[PDB]
Amino acid sequence: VTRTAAHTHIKGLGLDESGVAKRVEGGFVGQIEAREACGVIVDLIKAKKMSGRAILLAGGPSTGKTALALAISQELGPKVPFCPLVGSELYSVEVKKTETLMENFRRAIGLRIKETKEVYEEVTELTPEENPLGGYGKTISHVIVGLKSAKGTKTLRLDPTIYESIQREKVSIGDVIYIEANTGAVKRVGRSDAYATEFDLETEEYVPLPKGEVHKKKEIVQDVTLHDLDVANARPQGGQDVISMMGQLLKPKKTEITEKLRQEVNKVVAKYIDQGVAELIPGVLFIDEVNMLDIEIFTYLNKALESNIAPVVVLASNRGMTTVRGTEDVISPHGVPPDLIDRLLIVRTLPYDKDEIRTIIERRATVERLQVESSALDLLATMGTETSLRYALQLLAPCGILAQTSNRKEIVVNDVNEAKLLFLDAKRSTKILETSANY
Amino acid sequence: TRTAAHTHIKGLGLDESGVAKRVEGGFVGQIEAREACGVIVDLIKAKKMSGRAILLAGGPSTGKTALALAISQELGPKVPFCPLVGSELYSVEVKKTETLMENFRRAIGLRIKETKEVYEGEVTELTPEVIVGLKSAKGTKTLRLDPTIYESIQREKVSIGDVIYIEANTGAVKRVGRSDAYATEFDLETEEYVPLPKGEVHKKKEIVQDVTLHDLDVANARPQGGQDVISMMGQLLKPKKTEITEKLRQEVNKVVAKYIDQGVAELIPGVLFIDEVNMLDIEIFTYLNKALESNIAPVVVLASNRGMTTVRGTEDVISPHGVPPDLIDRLLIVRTLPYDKDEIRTIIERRATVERLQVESSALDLLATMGTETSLRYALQLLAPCGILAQTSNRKEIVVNDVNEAKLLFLDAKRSTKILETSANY
Amino acid sequence: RKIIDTFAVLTPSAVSLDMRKLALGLNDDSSVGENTRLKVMQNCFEVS
Amino acid sequence: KSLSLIAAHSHITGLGLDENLQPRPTSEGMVGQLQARRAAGVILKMVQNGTIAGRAVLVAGPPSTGKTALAMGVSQSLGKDVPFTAIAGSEIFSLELSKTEALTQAFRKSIGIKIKEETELIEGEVVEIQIDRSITGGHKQGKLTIKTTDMETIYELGNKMIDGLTKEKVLAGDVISIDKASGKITKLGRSFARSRDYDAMGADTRFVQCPEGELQKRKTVVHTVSLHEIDVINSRTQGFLALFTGDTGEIRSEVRDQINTKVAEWKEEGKAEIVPGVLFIDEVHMLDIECFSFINRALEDEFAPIVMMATNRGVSKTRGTNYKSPHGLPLDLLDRSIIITTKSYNEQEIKTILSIRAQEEEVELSSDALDLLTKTGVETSLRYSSNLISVAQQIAMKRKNNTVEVEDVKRAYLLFLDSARSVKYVQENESQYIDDQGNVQISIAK
Amino acid sequence: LKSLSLIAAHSHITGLGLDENLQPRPTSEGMVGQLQARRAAGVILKMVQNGTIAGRAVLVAGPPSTGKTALAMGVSQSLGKDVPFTAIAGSEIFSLELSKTEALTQAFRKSIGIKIKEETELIEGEVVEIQIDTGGHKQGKLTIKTTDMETIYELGNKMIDGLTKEKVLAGDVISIDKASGKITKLGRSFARSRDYDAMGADTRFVQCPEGELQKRKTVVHTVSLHEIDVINSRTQGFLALFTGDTGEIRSEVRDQINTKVAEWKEEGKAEIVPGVLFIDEVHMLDIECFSFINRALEDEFAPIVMMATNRGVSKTRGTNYKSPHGLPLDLLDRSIIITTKSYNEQEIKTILSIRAQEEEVELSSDALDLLTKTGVETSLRYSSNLISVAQQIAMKRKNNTVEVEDVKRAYLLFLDSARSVKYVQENESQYIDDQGNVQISIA
Ligand SMILES: Nc1ncnc2c1ncn2[C@@H]1O[C@H](COP(=O)(O)OP(=O)(O)O)[C@@H](O)[C@H]1O
Ligand SMILES: Nc1ncnc2c1ncn2[C@@H]1O[C@H](COP(=O)(O)OP(=O)(O)O)[C@@H](O)[C@H]1O
Ligand SMILES: Nc1ncnc2c1ncn2[C@@H]1O[C@H](COP(=O)(O)OP(=O)(O)O)[C@@H](O)[C@H]1O
Ligand SMILES: Nc1ncnc2c1ncn2[C@@H]1O[C@H](COP(=O)(O)OP(=O)(O)O)[C@@H](O)[C@H]1O
Ligand SMILES: [Mg+2]
Ligand SMILES: [Mg+2]
Ligand SMILES: [Mg+2]
Ligand SMILES: [Mg+2]
């Protein structure tokens, strides 16, 4: 009941304080310069000291850009936010893609808020009863309501709004509630087990009797980004009449976030952090297949990188002397214009080697819990060195299938050649399609 | 009465062996097209197979659409013919593929026998909480209104002296009006006086109202209870066509299967039509290429005629009829030949007979000469103008003066083109 | 009224029951909140 | 059930293969293509393993090479409990879901989850349904005598289930598949006791199903749903309306993230069952570069169902780009994925396929007509004769004789044309129909 | 850093606050040079601050990274507050539901400044304690007990049944309008804090105000007229202020609002406040935008626009012909030009040191001079990233000073653009052309 898809064999960069890498550790083999640079960058990130850093790496397919991205994402831990999405997802429908890019920058930056809350909880007894002091009919403002719980009973009266909350919950005398005093409303645990068994059947859950003292108190810490707050504020949350139900039944669409809302949320988050409620963490942004973006984005990012809150982004283009998608004469290395590369630096992610590739194949065999023979491993690694490692990677599993159908737990030259015969590659298709009368 | 270029065709004329006569029921020549159409007619009358399509190729005025109308009127009333043009599939609020499947689902006829009952009577009392005491000719019974239909009843201003035609299964209420029994209320009463309905209030009937697949699709996708207020909100929140997916398709398939296995219902296929597939883009052609590879797609006919022209939606796919090569390779070609002098003569003769024009011999022959000289349509469009001209020029028959006046008045494309190369301005 | 009375003869073909109350939110069973159903049917009673 | 009278693709029921992953020359309709069927068996064992992800395979080669037959055989051979997604890539465009939303919906539909819920029951003939008033001492004395064939027993209603019986107007004696966390009591109809009632003539009008199982027993009911239902439930409080009508509305990403976490922990807690299916797509040469990048990242993603992607055209123009590459796909994805070539057929397998078609259509053919059909098919294509057999059968009825003779096939051949016949007919009529310019010389004379 | 702002690439530069002489200095507020440019910018800023002449225009040119965006931000900072700044880039006008022309009109409508004043009246401190001698309100007079005056107010038909409205226990501070207004609760008293343990969300406790009751209070607002447009767009147009579904505002509302603001200015109830528009890299914009602005920038309410671009002889988007600066002659005629100059060593090193100070980064002599060489052979932005990366190296190297070691490590592990292009041209074999020409094969 496991699924490993080109990953889960990587768990970290495998560095030290002195920038010393390990030849075989964390699912990474080789790339001393790339690992050193990634370690330096993540060390800079962990300090939360800056914003808007950027970097472009030149790496061909299968050279290890996605592996590095996943490793760096895991370096900062699950709690540090990350949102690496495809470069073709920018071109949306219901919202202009620059607004989407602003939304992603808003999502990336993180925060940690907290709140302490109290709550009371079955009902021991009940005594309902102020004066109008004038022409009013009456004035009901206090009712003693029981609170059983388990470890002690403490009945107490509050504002009448809690009383109408009791009727709103429609709880009987033998019914347990969960009333957070911050609002005076009711959260329903359910019915009770003491005054239960009044009948042989009950669709309503009997519900376990609440455990602990009634005057419960606790504190909660939640790490929530700002875009969730924006979308929560955008739509209504309550209501009783037709507008609320029709709006909730209505399907909301993605819209444009106004900058005045940005000012408002910055103001309120500053007020809350100044009280010690929340602590600040930046974000991390990654985009793959960036060279397909158009010149207007490639030049708007020139000023977007100057945003004072924008977190660290990583830029990844694999091509070379290509024109930006939609440019008549703006041809640049990796399809990124020079006026944009004047704001960041360049790393070189290079392909792998012979022992490196054979160890990669062996480790993929390990994570796929299959045993590989020396001859088959060397054949796979060699033909990867001539053409491509991914061919051997995608032949490993069907070769294991062949071995299982042969009732053996190892790959033999027979299995790999049978998979080669039954499954071609790009190179064998570069010289076979031309002689096809039918397209 | 009115006639629009058709209704002269009244069937292929196929004999007991499927061979049509020369000129019968508005037909001229084209034995290949007639025989192929008869073969397809027999195959459809078999009512066993499905998922096959043909195209008939022919020039202008070659009887392609004429043969389509002939096969349509030959099939009969119950089996429907679906006419559609490449411009129709370009919808607004839904994608073209879904429109094609809506056409496919509404194409197949499904004889079904569902049940309806109606409560209709004079109201005797109403009890809010709901009672509506309908009093028919011999029955007086009090239903209960659900709160929604109770509100609908309230809005119907129904009071003592009123009769309502409230259906039982749908539930919607249609008031019949003030009771004719209380005709002695005002000598000039505004409301219509309708008596107490016959039979019991809960009148029950056996109905043969059938359902197309799209009909029962919209039945649950967009409920149409109608007259009740909640039905108004139901038909107002989503009044349009929603993008029905394959899940509801399978649910609908199960529902129609159980209904047809109930025994009374049955299935009948249908024919769909497309004209000028040359204008269709490569996207719809590619999608229908994988759509005909199914078990439900009913019979469709193609009418197109193009030479070595690029297929619309592409830039390099050059093929006859503007059809992509794969579709041509998976579709059956029916040939049509250009009309002849005698065919033109008979066509003009029949078009004069249907238009109540007793065109004489020499006039008919000269009209045939013009038909053979420039184009059939050019001569055909002149039958009514020449008759009306002779009527204004006091002639029951059509003398050469009338046709010469028409030929100097209503020019053809060739004469206009001849004009167009000598002009100081366009 | 004279422009709306006579011609109203067209009947939509197919209807499926229990598809409107399931859409408005008023019924004996729905995933939406049940705090509105009574006041919603009262609105239906007296909403013009 | 599943009303579909006949099709050109309704002739294969379950494929045919062996435990050795070796092809069957006559594998339940589809024949030949030893490499294709062996690869189909390899993929079948792969998906039964359920241990790999992010694999893309290209069914290359000329068209008409049993590619759809291969897909259908795989689908019918894997078996039930594993729903598929067999949809051509042409209808990815829509006016309600974007390309990204459509691709995400397809990917999340390709991976399923089964859910086991420990629901309960109270079965047995409930001969009476008594509803007493809400007495103060006991808030509901509602008697109701549920009893199966095994035992005789009475019960009590807790002032909540009275309308549960009669949400739709039903009577007592109904077998009730009640659920504690539902509130919607389902009545199964009528039921039986084990009594003879009174002395005089009676016991009339009693023939229904009687309860068989125990009065109460736990049912670990299994339900299979896709991520579509869960996501539409998350987006809106009501989700069945959008599941039926089809107006979900482009649900947002944090929903998918929380569903990912919830499904992961449910699998870790032993309440759900992961079913990682496989997605089928068509016309990949027609796919566009943004979809190419989408699938490129999806393959490297930790969660990606296997892909059955095929390009009928070879060395065709790559849609969405200005350049043409083999298979209509650039070399990046071409090297990323794997390739299975498919070659055309000889005549004898066409003959066998057409014979299978005929015996499926239960038509008493004559072998002369079959030989004519084989010749016509081998000259042009299989589908030619696949339609010619049906039209010749129609001509066989039209001449009042059941057997399909030579003249039927001859009339079918002469009436309906051929691709070569059509192209010859149109290239000699370059000035008779509508052309590039549309010049139609309707003028037969002068 | 009132908001969650962390740092800017130019945070040291906050304000083009030239001295009273307006004669440029070799160094000021962290910026160095731009002498004639700074003088002209000060003149422009004063002209904007004048608030009496509209329809002006200034153009900015020169290679980027010369502080142009920093120039505009410093101008905005020197303009102070109460003057909202329109932060719109070139790629923000091609919106879906907002066409470019009325999007520019909306940006200008936001750019305007206005002030509004209003006056209301209230009663403060009404610790009431109603006591009357059932219904009908016979002898309907209420005790009112605030800090200053403690009397009994007589009432009438609207209050004797208005006191039974807002049903309260009359043990709290309440507000009433002496100008025939309704009753509003401002909270209970501290004595009511103890009566209920957990006060409901509605119930809050505030002291009796220390003073009299009849308070005539004046209020002042600074709201752009486009906000009022959104407010009165529909019957209830309050939800649309933040959602963004404006809907291509019609011009009838625009001229009605112009008339209203003119008449309120003549009444003295409103007064104007100057506004500015600034969009960077105007070259990548449609020729339609330039044509529209060339007419719309001479209207009665025509705030100046901070034009800025850096391209060369190219074609205005939406046309085909070669154009100056990628801009039409009509737009390159009704404006004045700001240009920048190539960096020199002294300001390069000073700016690098100032940035290091802003980043809390210590730079020694060798590192500073080497990075000045980098920022003079290359641009300064590479050295501005290198100071950060080198300080990261140093703090990983168990020291805080930056010297040749960290700088050289960055130079080896981070590639210059020219050498990057050379590496691309010499290793093209692994790269891909437009047609997907990739040499995946190795051996
Ligand atoms: N240095 C490496 N060590 C181990 N595995 C690697 C290395 N580089 C790449 N891989 C593996 O190769 C697979 C494909 O890499 P890919 O994401 O295509 O690289 P790129 O992003 O450069 O195209 C990944 O699943 C990864 O696990
Ligand atoms: N066999 C026929 N008998 C009578 N009228 C015909 C016949 N064929 C064509 N016509 C007439 O010629 C016109 C063109 O025929 P139609 O099939 O509608 O389009 P086309 O033949 O140009 O594709 C029609 O209006 C029809 O009335
Ligand atoms: N090997 C085969 N055996 C039986 N039927 C086949 C075979 N190959 C194709 N067919 C028939 O052809 C149709 C699918 O065409 P196919 O050959 O798959 O085209 P393509 O290869 O271009 O997808 C199916 O309906 C099937 O009945
Ligand atoms: N006179 C100066 N004093 C201090 N720093 C400067 C000066 N001029 C430029 N800089 C630095 O150089 C950078 C200039 O960037 P900028 O020109 O605003 O980018 P763009 O050209 O995209 O508008 C700023 O980040 C700033 O820190
Ligand atoms: Mg025709
Ligand atoms: Mg096929
Ligand atoms: Mg990729
Ligand atoms: Mg700039």
Side-chain angles (χ1 to χ4, degrees), chain B residues 219-223 225-288:
Chain B
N220 56 27
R222 285 91 67 191
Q227 315 174 295
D228 188 4
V229 60
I230 60 164
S231 53
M232 183 278 288
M233 283 74 74
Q235 65 183 177
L236 191 71
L237 269 67
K238 38 180 182 75
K240 64 223 171 203
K241 162 63 153 184
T242 180
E243 284 203 0
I244 303 297
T245 185
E246 291 78 8
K247 265 180 77 186
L248 204 68
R249 283 291 221 180
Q250 303 332 289
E251 180 260 349
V252 163
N253 189 9
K254 277 156 83 175
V255 173
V256 304
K258 71 179 291 295
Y259 290 179
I260 199 164
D261 300 344
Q262 202 190 101
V264 181
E266 68 186 2
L267 63 88
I268 58 169
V271 187
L272 299 97
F273 158 72
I274 192 66
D275 200 351
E276 275 291 278
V277 301
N278 47 355
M279 65 145 270
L280 274 186
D281 72 8
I282 196 66
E283 197 66 39
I284 187 52
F285 274 127
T286 294
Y287 173 75
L288 200 43

Side-chain angles (χ1 to χ4, degrees), chain A residues 302-303 306 343, chain E residues 8-13 28-34 63-71 278 280-281 310 343 347 350-352 354-355 380-381 384:
Chain A
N302 277 320
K303 199 193 148 83
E306 280 278 0
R343 290 157 149 98
Chain E
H10 39 269
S11 199
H12 48 292
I13 299 290
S28 46
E29 208 264 331
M31 61 79 71
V32 160
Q34 298 301 319
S65 69
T66 45
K68 294 186 284 186
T69 309
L71 184 64
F278 156 72
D280 206 348
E281 306 307 328
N310 55 9
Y343 273 51
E347 72 267 19
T350 58
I351 289 163
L352 280 193
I354 291 157
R355 272 313 309 181
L380 189 150
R381 272 168 173 155
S384 169

Side-chain angles (χ1 to χ4, degrees), chain B residues 17 35 52 59 92 242-243 247-248 253 283 293-294 296 305-309 330 333 336 372-374, chain D residues 3 7 9 68 90 95 229 244-245 383 386-387 390 398 411 417 425 433-436 443-446:
Chain B
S17 293
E35 210 158 357
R52 297 176 200 268
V92 187
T242 180
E243 284 203 0
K247 265 180 77 186
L248 204 68
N253 189 9
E283 197 66 39
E293 287 177 33
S294 159
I296 307 300
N305 62 6
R306 285 301 286 260
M308 295 298 102
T309 79
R330 64 173 36 75
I333 295 94
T336 311
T372 65
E373 270 145 359
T374 74
Chain D
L3 195 142
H9 304 247
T68 317
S90 200
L95 276 160
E229 312 213 342
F244 303 150
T245 67
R383 311 209 163 89
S386 86
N387 294 318
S390 308
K398 88 176 284 292
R411 198 164 157 285
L417 308 199
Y425 167 69
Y433 289 10
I434 315 171
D435 204 41
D436 298 282
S443 179
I444 181 170
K446 281 190 196 171

Side-chain angles (χ1 to χ4, degrees), chain E residues 2-19 21-123 125 127-130 132 135-136 140 142-143:
Chain E
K2 281 281 286 294
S3 295
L4 212 60
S5 173
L6 282 79
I7 198 170
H10 39 269
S11 199
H12 48 292
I13 299 290
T14 52
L16 266 75
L18 263 171
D19 69 326
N21 201 2
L22 272 73
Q23 296 295 107
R25 280 82 56 97
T27 306
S28 46
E29 208 264 331
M31 61 79 71
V32 160
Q34 298 301 319
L35 314 174
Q36 310 301 325
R38 179 70 174 269
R39 183 172 178 83
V43 174
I44 288 279
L45 197 148
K46 180 263 172 186
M47 174 65 156
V48 173
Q49 260 175 327
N50 202 355
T52 44
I53 307 99
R56 300 314 215 226
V58 62
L59 170 68
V60 185
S65 69
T66 45
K68 294 186 284 186
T69 309
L71 184 64
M73 271 315 268
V75 163
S76 82
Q77 190 81 44
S78 163
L79 287 152
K81 275 298 298 299
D82 203 15
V83 292
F85 198 80
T86 314
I88 279 179
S91 278
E92 319 194 12
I93 59 179
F94 321 91
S95 48
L96 270 74
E97 289 82 3
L98 309 175
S99 63
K100 64 90 176 179
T101 291
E102 62 86 20
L104 269 49
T105 301
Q106 288 172 1
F108 278 119
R109 286 292 175 265
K110 161 72 179 160
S111 284
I112 74 183
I114 207 69
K115 313 178 163 205
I116 302 185
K117 308 163 310 305
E118 196 285 343
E119 267 90 4
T120 47
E121 196 270 347
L122 285 170
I123 298 312
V127 186
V128 171
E129 203 271 319
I130 51 171
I132 191 167
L142 62 84
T143 63

Side-chain angles (χ1 to χ4, degrees), chain B residues 62-66:
Chain B
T62 47
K64 315 191 295 303
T65 300

Side-chain angles (χ1 to χ4, degrees), chain E residues 172-193:
Chain E
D172 58 357
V173 59
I174 301 299
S175 87
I176 179 66
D177 171 44
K178 194 58 70 73
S180 306
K182 65 178 72 66
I183 305 92
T184 291
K185 180 176 174 63
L186 270 297
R188 295 173 75 181
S189 179
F190 180 49
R192 331 297 305 162
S193 86

Side-chain angles (χ1 to χ4, degrees), chain A residues 16-19 33 36-37 40-41 43-44 47-51 53-55 58 60-61 93-96 98 110-111 118 120 131-132 134-135 137 141-142 156-162 181-184 226 234 255-261 263-264 266-267 269-270 273 280 282 296-297 299-300 302-303 306-309 318-322 328 333-334 338-339 341-348 350-351 384-388 427, chain E residues 2-10 64-65 69 73 88-92 94-98 110 129-130 132 135-136 164 167-170 188 194-198 200-203 205 226-227 241-244 278 280-281 283-284 310-311 315 355 359-361 378-382 384-389 392-393 395-398 409 412-417 420-421 423-425 430-434 436 438 440-443:
Chain A
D16 74 337
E17 180 267 339
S18 299
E33 308 308 314
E36 283 156 334
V40 160
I41 290 293
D43 281 318
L44 191 149
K48 321 177 196 68
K49 273 278 265 170
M50 271 175 168
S51 170
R53 271 277 162 269
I55 181 70
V93 164
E94 288 175 351
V95 57
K96 156 43 191 163
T98 292
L111 194 80
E118 75 158 334
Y120 302 170
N131 69 333
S141 187
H142 70 277
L156 176 55
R157 83 288 178 274
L158 316 168
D159 272 321
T161 63
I162 296 90
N182 288 331
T183 62
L226 284 76
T255 64
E256 294 178 353
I257 280 295
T258 177
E259 61 86 20
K260 63 183 91 76
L261 193 81
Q263 283 313 93
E264 194 282 339
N266 293 15
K267 162 172 68 180
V269 72
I273 65 157
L280 73 164
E296 59 87 19
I297 285 300
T299 61
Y300 162 77
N302 277 320
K303 199 193 148 83
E306 280 278 0
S307 184
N308 299 323
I309 306 93
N318 59 340
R319 259 79 183 201
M321 271 305 178
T322 72
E328 60 272 24
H334 315 81
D339 51 6
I341 71 169
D342 207 20
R343 290 157 149 98
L344 55 86
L345 276 297
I346 292 296
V347 185
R348 308 193 285 98
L350 270 285
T385 61
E386 282 100 13
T387 62
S388 64
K427 170 63 181 305
Chain E
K2 281 281 286 294
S3 295
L4 212 60
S5 173
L6 282 79
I7 198 170
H10 39 269
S65 69
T69 309
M73 271 315 268
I88 279 179
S91 278
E92 319 194 12
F94 321 91
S95 48
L96 270 74
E97 289 82 3
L98 309 175
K110 161 72 179 160
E129 203 271 319
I130 51 171
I132 191 167
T164 194
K167 298 177 183 178
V168 290
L169 56 88
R188 295 173 75 181
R194 44 192 39 77
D195 59 20
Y196 299 124
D197 170 278
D202 47 346
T203 52
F205 318 107
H226 156 268
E227 305 316 278
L241 275 297
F242 288 82
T243 55
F278 156 72
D280 206 348
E281 306 307 328
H283 64 262
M284 51 66 58
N310 55 9
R311 282 293 278 99
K315 172 258 289 181
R355 272 313 309 181
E359 309 169 1
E360 298 97 8
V361 164
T378 76
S379 68
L380 189 150
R381 272 168 173 155
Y382 294 160
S384 169
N385 300 276
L386 201 155
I387 58 189
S388 177
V389 76
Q392 184 39 66
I393 300 148
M395 294 182 286
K396 195 51 68 172
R397 209 178 48 253
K398 296 295 183 289
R409 179 259 163 188
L412 272 297
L413 279 74
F414 299 92
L415 196 40
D416 165 43
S417 160
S420 196
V421 160
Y423 195 90
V424 166
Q425 298 291 102
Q430 68 192 359
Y431 291 165
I432 309 181
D433 205 61
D434 168 42
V438 65
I440 303 176
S441 304
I442 298 93

